[PDB]
Amino acid sequence: KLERRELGNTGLNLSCVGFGASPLGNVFGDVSEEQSIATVIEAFNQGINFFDTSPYYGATLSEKVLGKCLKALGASRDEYIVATKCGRYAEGFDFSAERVTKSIDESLERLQLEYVDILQCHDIEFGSLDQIVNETIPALQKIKESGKTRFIGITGLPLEVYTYVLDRVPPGTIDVVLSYCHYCINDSTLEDMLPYFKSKGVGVINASPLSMGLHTENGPPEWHPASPEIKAACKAAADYCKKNGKNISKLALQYSLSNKDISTTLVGMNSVKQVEENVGAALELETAGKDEKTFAEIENILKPIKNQSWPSGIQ
Ligand SMILES: NC(=O)c1ccc[n+]([C@@H]2O[C@H](COP(=O)([O-])OP(=O)(O)OC[C@H]3O[C@@H](n4cnc5c(N)ncnc54)[C@H](O)[C@@H]3O)[C@@H](O)[C@H]2O)c1
């Protein structure tokens, strides 16, 4: 069975591999609704029980499609865990209490759910962090008390933005944090913040273990924000694996899964083959361990750009 890990103090047990549903909004090329449904059904059948989306992905399309996918499961509601977000929309950012209070109703309508398990502020580095602390999080606390979400959180790229918020709200205010692109073969800096997150009692969700396509055979999309030198070294690592009969995406995901202090790693998936590969990579990690010789050679290739990121937001 696919390993499950406790998520902070929420009592939720998430599969160590999570379903990133942003491709269901066509972020990484177009995908049919029938394929999306089959992909989620296969993910659930393989033991994945955690699904993450946002009103932003595909201008609310990802949520609509995921809502159809989850209905097609025909499963008990407590057998899967749904996370979505608020504050970032196709028409821009709005972290006001009025916006996010409307947003949860809009998301529940699209998702065809009475409640989500997790609701998080999306990309807070683009907002006023003082508004997040003093207006947005209180509004989310009222949404939680209404029952429309069970737990609340915050997401963003820069690791520093979390400390600003978590230092200023009372203990136990935030249930979960989602960080992305910082626990993968080229960037492990999320491990630097895990001691702080443990100190605040927050469950940690990692996302983008392929760093949004850097750790794939096809390579990153044209819009990927990483510098050319990050892209060149990631391509060299993928070419090394291809030359030696190795799967760069399998190894990248196995790297991200190896830290047990992270409850789940969301990986964007848009096909049943990707689900079969990614669950298989997780299962094989438990029974065969890691290919240490290839990881060491991958590390040597990525070393010059290790832990380099890119600017995001307005802080
Ligand atoms: N600020 C935030 O809150 C934030 C930011 C980014 C992502 N996320 C969440 O995290 C999810 C995952 O991140 P992501 O999708 O942007 O990047 P990712 O690292 O998960 O990679 C996704 C891309 O890799 C491809 N892929 C997946 N498995 C593969 C395989 N076995 N072989 C080859 N290719 C494979 C996917 O099709 C997609 O093109 C997202 O869907 C979303 O849910 C949140």
From TrEMBL:
Keywords: Nucleotide-binding. It comes from the Eukaryota. This is L-galactose dehydrogenase. One of its GO terms (molecular function) is nucleotide binding. NAD(+) binds at residues 22, 52, 57, 123, 155, 208, 210, 212, 268, 274, 277-278. The keyword Ribosomal protein does not apply. One of its GO terms (cellular component) is cytosol. One of its GO terms (biological process) is L-ascorbic acid biosynthetic process. Gene3D superfamilies: NADP-dependent oxidoreductase domain. The keyword Nucleotide-binding applies. InterPro entries: AKR, LGALDH-like, NAD(P)_OxRdtase_dom_sf, NADP_OxRdtase_dom. Residues 17-285 form the NADP-dependent oxidoreductase domain.
